[PDB]
Ligand binder design. Structure first.
Ligand code: NA
Ligand code: NA
Lengths: 123, 123
C-alpha cells in the first residue's frame, strides 16, 4: 500500500506447532510474523503471533528457511492472514501477501526460487 | 488495513467492456474502483481505472448492482487487483478485498446476499 511500494504476490502456507502454544486466532484475522533468531532448533525460525501479540505457532520450517533471509534483509514486507481453519488442532492455513520496492523484487524472487517456492498473484 | 478496521472477505469477478477503453493494466497490479453515478446506462455503474486514472472498463453490471450501495454508504473499502489475464481483449479477472468497520459486517453481507453474492475468505 505504502506509496513507492507495490504488491509483489502471495504465498499460501501453514502455521504449525499449534499444540505447543496457547495463543488463539479468529478467521479472517491478521497475524504477525516475527523472526526468532535465538531459536535453539532453527536459526531461521519465524514465530506467528496473534494481533494481541501472543504466540500461536511457527511457520513451517521449509517456508521459514526461505523467508528468514527476506525478513532479515528487509527485502519485502510480508502480511499474514488466516483465511479459515482458525480452530484447527495441529496446523492452520495462512495466506501471506508480499509487497515492497522493485529494486528488491528480483532478490525476493531468486530467494524463493532457490528454495523451491514461487509467488502467486497478489494479494 | 488500518486499525480498527477488519477484513470482511474477498470477491472474484471480472472487468468488462475492455474493447471500449484505452487504459491498460499490468498483470498482477492494483486498479481503482470509481463510482459513475451519472452513467446513463446504469446509475449503479462502477468504473475500473488503472493506476494513472485511465479507465480500463467497468465492473460487470450484476456486481455493480450489489456493490454501489456499499460504496455510496461507505460500508466497506474495496481494493481491486488484476491477478492475471491483464492482456485479455474483452474481460479480465478481478480480485476484490473488502475491509471496514466491524459494525458494518452484517450490512455488507445482507447487501451482497440481496444480489445473490457472498464474500469468500480474506484477503
Ligand atoms: Na481497452
Ligand atoms: Na473514460
Amino acid at each position: 500500500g505504502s506509496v513507492d511500494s507495490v504488491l509483489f504476490g502471495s504465498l499460501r502456507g501453514h502455521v504449525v506447532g499449534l499444540r505447543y502454544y496457547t495463543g488463539v486466532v479468529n478467521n479472517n484475522e491478521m497475524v504477525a510474523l516475527q523472526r526468532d533468531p535465538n531459536n535453539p532448533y532453527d536459526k531461521n525460525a519465524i514465530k506467528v503471533n496473534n494481533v494481541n501479540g501472543n504466540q500461536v505457532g511457527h511457520l513451517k520450517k521449509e517456508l521459514a528457511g526461505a523467508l528468514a533471509y527476506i525478513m532479515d534483509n528487509k527485502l519485502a514486507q510480508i502480511e499474514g492472514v488466516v483465511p479459515f481453519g482458525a480452530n484447527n488442532a495441529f496446523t492452520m492455513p495462512l495466506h501471506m501477501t508480499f509487497w515492497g520496492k522493485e529494486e528488491n523484487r528480483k532478490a525476493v524472487s531468486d530467494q524463493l526460487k532457490k528454495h523451491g517456492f514461487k509467488l502467486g498473484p497478489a494479494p
